[PDB]
Amino acid sequence: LPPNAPACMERQLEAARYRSDGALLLGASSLSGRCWAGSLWLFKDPCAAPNEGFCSAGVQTEAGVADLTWVGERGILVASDSGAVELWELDENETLIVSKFCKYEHDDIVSTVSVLSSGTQAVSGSKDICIKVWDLAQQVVLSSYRAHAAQVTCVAASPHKDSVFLSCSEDNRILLWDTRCPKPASQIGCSAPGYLPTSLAWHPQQSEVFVFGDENGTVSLVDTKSTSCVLSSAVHSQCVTGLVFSPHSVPFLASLSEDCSLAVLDSSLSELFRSQAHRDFVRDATWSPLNHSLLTTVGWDHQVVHHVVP
Amino acid sequence: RVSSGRDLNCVPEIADTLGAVAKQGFDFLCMPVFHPRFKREFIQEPAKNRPGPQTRSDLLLSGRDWNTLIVGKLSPWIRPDSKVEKIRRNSEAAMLQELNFGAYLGLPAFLLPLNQEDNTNLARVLTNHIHTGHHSSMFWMRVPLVAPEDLRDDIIENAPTTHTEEYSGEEKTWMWWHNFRTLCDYSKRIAVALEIGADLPSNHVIDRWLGEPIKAAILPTSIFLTNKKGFPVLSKMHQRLIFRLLKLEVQFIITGTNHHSEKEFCSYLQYLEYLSQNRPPPNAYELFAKGYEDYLQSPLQPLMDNLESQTYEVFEKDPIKYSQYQQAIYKCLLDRVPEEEKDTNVQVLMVLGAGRGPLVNASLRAAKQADRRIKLYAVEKNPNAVVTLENWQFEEWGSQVTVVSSDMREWVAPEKADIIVSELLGSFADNELSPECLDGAQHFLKDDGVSIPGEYTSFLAPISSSKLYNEVRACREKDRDPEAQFEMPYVVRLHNFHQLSAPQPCFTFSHPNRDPMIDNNRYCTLEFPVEVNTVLHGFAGYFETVLYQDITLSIRPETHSPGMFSWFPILFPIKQPITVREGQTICVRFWRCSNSKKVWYEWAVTAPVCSAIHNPTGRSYTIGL
Ligand SMILES: CSC[C@H]1O[C@@H](n2cnc3c(N)ncnc32)[C@H](O)[C@@H]1O
Ligand SMILES: [Cl-]
Numbered sequence A: 001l002p003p004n005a006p007a008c009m010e011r012q013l014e015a016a017r018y019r020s021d022g023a024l025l026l027g028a029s030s031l032s033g034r035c036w037a038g039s040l041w042l043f044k045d046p047c048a049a050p051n052e053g054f055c056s057a058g059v060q061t062e063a064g065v066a067d068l069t070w071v072g073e074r075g076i077l078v079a080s081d082s083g084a085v086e087l088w089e090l091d092e093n094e095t096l097i098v099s100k101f102c103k104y105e106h107d108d109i110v111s112t113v114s115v116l117s118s119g120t121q122a123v124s125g126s127k128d129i130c131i132k133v134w135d136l137a138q139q140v141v142l143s144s145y146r147a148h149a150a151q152v153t154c155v156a157a158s159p160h161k162d163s164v165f166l167s168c169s170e171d172n173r174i175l176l177w178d179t180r181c182p183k184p185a186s187q188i189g190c191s192a193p194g195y196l197p198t199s200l201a202w203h204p205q206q207s208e209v210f211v212f213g214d215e216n217g218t219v220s221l222v223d224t225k226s227t228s229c230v231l232s233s234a235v236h237s238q239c240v241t242g243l244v245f246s247p248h249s250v251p252f253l254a255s256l257s258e259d260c261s262l263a264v265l266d267s268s269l270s271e272l273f274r275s276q277a278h279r280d281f282v283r284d285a286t287w288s289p290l291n292h293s294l295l296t297t298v299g300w301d302h303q304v305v306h307h308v309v310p
Numbered sequence B: 001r002v003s004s005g006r007d008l009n010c011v012p013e014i015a016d017t018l019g020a021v022a023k024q025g026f027d028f029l030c031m032p033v034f035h036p037r038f039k040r041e042f043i044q045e046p047a048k049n050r051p052g053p054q055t056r057s058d059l060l061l062s063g064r065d066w067n068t069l070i071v072g073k074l075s076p077w078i079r080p081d082s083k084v085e086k087i088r089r090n091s092e093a094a095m096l097q098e099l100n101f102g103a104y105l106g107l108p109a110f111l112l113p114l115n116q117e118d119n120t121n122l123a124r125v126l127t128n129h130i131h132t133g134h135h136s137s138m139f140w141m142r143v144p145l146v147a148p149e150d151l152r153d154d155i156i157e158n159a160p161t162t163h164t165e166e167y168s169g170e171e172k173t174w175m176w177w178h179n180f181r182t183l184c185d186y187s188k189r190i191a192v193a194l195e196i197g198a199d200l201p202s203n204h205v206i207d208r209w210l211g212e213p214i215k216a217a218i219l220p221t222s223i224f225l226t227n228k229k230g231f232p233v234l235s236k237m238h239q240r241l242i243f244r245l246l247k248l249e250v251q252f253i254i255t256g257t258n259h260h261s262e263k264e265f266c267s268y269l270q271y272l273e274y275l276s277q278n279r280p281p282p283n284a285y286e287l288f289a290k291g292y293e294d295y296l297q298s299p300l301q302p303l304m305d306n307l308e309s310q311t312y313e314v315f316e317k318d319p320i321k322y323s324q325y326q327q328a329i330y331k332c333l334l335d336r337v338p339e340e341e342k343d344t345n346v347q348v349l350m351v352l353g354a355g356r357g358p359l360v361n362a363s364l365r366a367a368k369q370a371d372r373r374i375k376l377y378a379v380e381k382n383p384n385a386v387v388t389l390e391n392w393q394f395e396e397w398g399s400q401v402t403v404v405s406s407d408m409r410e411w412v413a414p415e416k417a418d419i420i421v422s423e424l425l426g427s428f429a430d431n432e433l434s435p436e437c438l439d440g441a442q443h444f445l446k447d448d449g450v451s452i453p454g455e456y457t458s459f460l461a462p463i464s465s466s467k468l469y470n471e472v473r474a475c476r477e478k479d480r481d482p483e484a485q486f487e488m489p490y491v492v493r494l495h496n497f498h499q500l501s502a503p504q505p506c507f508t509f510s511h512p513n514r515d516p517m518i519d520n521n522r523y524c525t526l527e528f529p530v531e532v533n534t535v536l537h538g539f540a541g542y543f544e545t546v547l548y549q550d551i552t553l554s555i556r557p558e559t560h561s562p563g564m565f566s567w568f569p570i571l572f573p574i575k576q577p578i579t580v581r582e583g584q585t586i587c588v589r590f591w592r593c594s595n596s597k598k599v600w601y602e603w604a605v606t607a608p609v610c611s612a613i614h615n616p617t618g619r620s621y622t623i624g625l
Helices: B014-024 B063-069 B085-104 B120-130 B169-183 B203-211 B236-247 B266-277 B284-288 B309-316 B319-334 B358-370 B383-400 B434-444 B466-473
Strands: A012-018 A024-029 A038-043 A057-061 A065-071 A075-080 A084-090 A097-103 A110-115 A121-126 A131-135 A140-145 A152-157 A164-169 A174-178 A185-188 A197-202 A209-214 A218-223 A228-234 A240-245 A253-257 A262-265 A271-275 A282-287 A294-299 A305-308 B004-007 B028-032 B070-073 B109-113 B138-144 B190-195 B214-220 B251-255 B346-352 B373-379 B401-404 B417-421 B445-452 B455-464 B504-510 B522-529 B534-548 B551-554 B570-580 B585-594 B598-607
Touching (some): A012 A065, A012 A294, A038 A065, A038 A075, A057 A084, A075 A110, A152 A197, A209 A240, A240 A282, A253 A282, B070 B085, B085 B120, B138 B169, B203 B466, B236 B266, B309 B383, B319 B445, B319 B534, B319 B551, B373 B383, B383 B401, B417 B434, B434 B445, B504 B522, B570 B585, B570 B598
Parallel strands (some): B004 B028, B070 B109, B109 B138, B373 B401
Antiparallel strands (some): A012 A024, A024 A038, A065 A075, A075 A084, A084 A097, A174 A185, B455 B534, B534 B570
16 A cells, blocks of 8 residues: 555545556445545556555545546546535646545535536536536636426536536436526437437537436447437446547447446447346446556446456 | 534444534434435346445444434435336335444434426335334425525526416425325325425415424525624525524524634524524423423313312412403493492302302402402302302301302302302313303392303314324224224314414303394304415314403414413314315305203314315214203
């Protein structure tokens, strides 16, 4: 265990993120037993995880970690059940992780986060139903949006725009946002209102394209221009918790679910791979920057699996 | 002062947390029994065979701790009413497990939400849990004053908020509760935890919840104005509400992070204690009526039964009523005996129903004030009280007072009387049979004779109280008609309730009754205009009496004799609650019926729908002659 790095990793690993260099960021929470809290970790070697003995850095958060995000190379932003968003700073030699800022602005659990195209700002999703606009630099909340009528599930920022982000909520609304418009939020859905929206991924290339996964395990393909759902497929036996796009030229879409299964989808929503390796809840996914055909999956089974994608 | 708790959706260490909240002054904690993000699968491998432990252990707190300080919270992921089979099955199983664990720990209450309209399967499942074992662990339903959907910000271009009036629509939150409750056949264990929002709704919406079973007010930190000095404070209007809720004695809860960051959580709590101690003191009435709030008692029948010592004791501890009685006689004397006739004319004054002699004493104070001469009879059938009277007459009253130990209908008087005086009146004026008693004694009144009281009138008002409806339903007894509870009046300090219309007179009687064919039998039709959506559970009763001229007594809340606590209101329940809508008239019909043997009331609601005729033929309830 490196300095400020505890022995045990909490069993429930909620986050799996790969830096440019191929470092692995793991955040995990304790959802069971007496101590109900969260951790932060670093794996300068990819396949060293989940063993803390080979980890380069780590720390413990006051509370659990529902969602975590990279802020470039140094910073890490947290969705804490505490009802706080918090930032921790990585070390110069990257040996330790120390809390930059911790602000209790949400009134309930903080469920989802994404950082803006700038990386100078971010947006948060809480079960208080509110979505907030953050100055990472000034460490404050310029805007509070109460668009939704239920708890907020996912908030995905536009890759290419600092004013545009998607939001999905249990109120069976998916929102496209432009901070610029006086009514920022704009409701987008298929023909008929359907099963709940659970997972959001913006397309890397085409900033007019996004995908949503329902609670029914049907992943859907959304064109904002026509604002009409062209294509959807039945991938998962259960709720689609996560949707991640590969770095590849024409990308690959990674679909993760509470059915404890993973699949990777082609551009026409057609499944190339099916992996039953995880024995519990598959939480997060990142693609190997270095070996682009490699995929890194976590779950509550404390299992870290590395994937060779065909 | 004010019982209060702190709601939280995050507890790393139950040990650490609990001390903190208590340090700050919180009587109780509301927290998850399983982690709110910790979602479980009950049917599908592999995650069905997830290895335990499924939560933290009971050992971490004293049984006493669990019993007194923890309120459980259903995990938010559990949605029994999901459109998707798999989620509905899993939430069914998860809700049972969580609820089952609450009871394992002996938690005093458990919080479940009404945050959408269709909560049918949820009610079904809870109802099952309730009909499994015999426990007293309450269930608090989390319902907002205002639906989250009608409190969104109008920042959605394609789906704007409708700024049209929604009278019916802003009451949607109550319909949520009403249905859930009704599916659950009004279990006494299911009460309301009423989430108060940023923006209070229209007063009419708040008017809904008056008589509902509310154990909790939930206040998010989001609703707290900040004073100049940075203190957490509440709208003038929120204060009126909090003041109202204190009167209903509820347990104030606090949810949300400490926005007033340059202060302890005590800041919030302090305001409530601050408002509480700043409320007016309890008046004399309010002191007397302390524990008797929505307490159902059988109406007294001092005709067919003999009142206990301590019964008479307390009922004489009403100074105002006897002041009023004294004064009525004071005025009658001066009006009957000219000052020239003062020593030539002594008046024959007969107390009919004397008990232990406060009215006789007041009859005496009346003469000393009005300086005229009065011959006293004390007629009383309870021979136990007659003991107190003949002990007084021997010691103090002397031969001025002839104690007559008999029924006023029996006693053959040596002489006719100038004035007859009586306190033979129930909470519905005539329910002790004051009319029949004084009708039988009227033959021994001089033709110019006065009665105090000269007249009385009952009044009736439609009410909504699911709490009293539940309390009445509870009064079932074995070896009696399973619905006798509903066909009988109860005296009660009506408290958790809503009067749907102002009172109207029901029955009136005048004494003496010079009527050629005296009949105390009555049929009356009443129409009560209602202007909110509401549910009728029964009809409150009060009365007014004329002692003499301008001297009078009333338990009618508009004309209420002030300080006079001698009579609590009466309640005529109905078997089946009747939905009423804004605009509609409640039509009630009341019959007073008699035998040689007994007198009784019957009643029917004839609009906006019909009720069954209640107490038909005095089957469930009568008053002995
Ligand atoms: C003060 S409560 C009424 C009192 O009047 C007495 N009372 C009621 N009815 C009669 C009656 N018919 N004759 C004599 N006393 C009565 C009761 O025993 C009681 O003490
Ligand atoms: Cl009383």
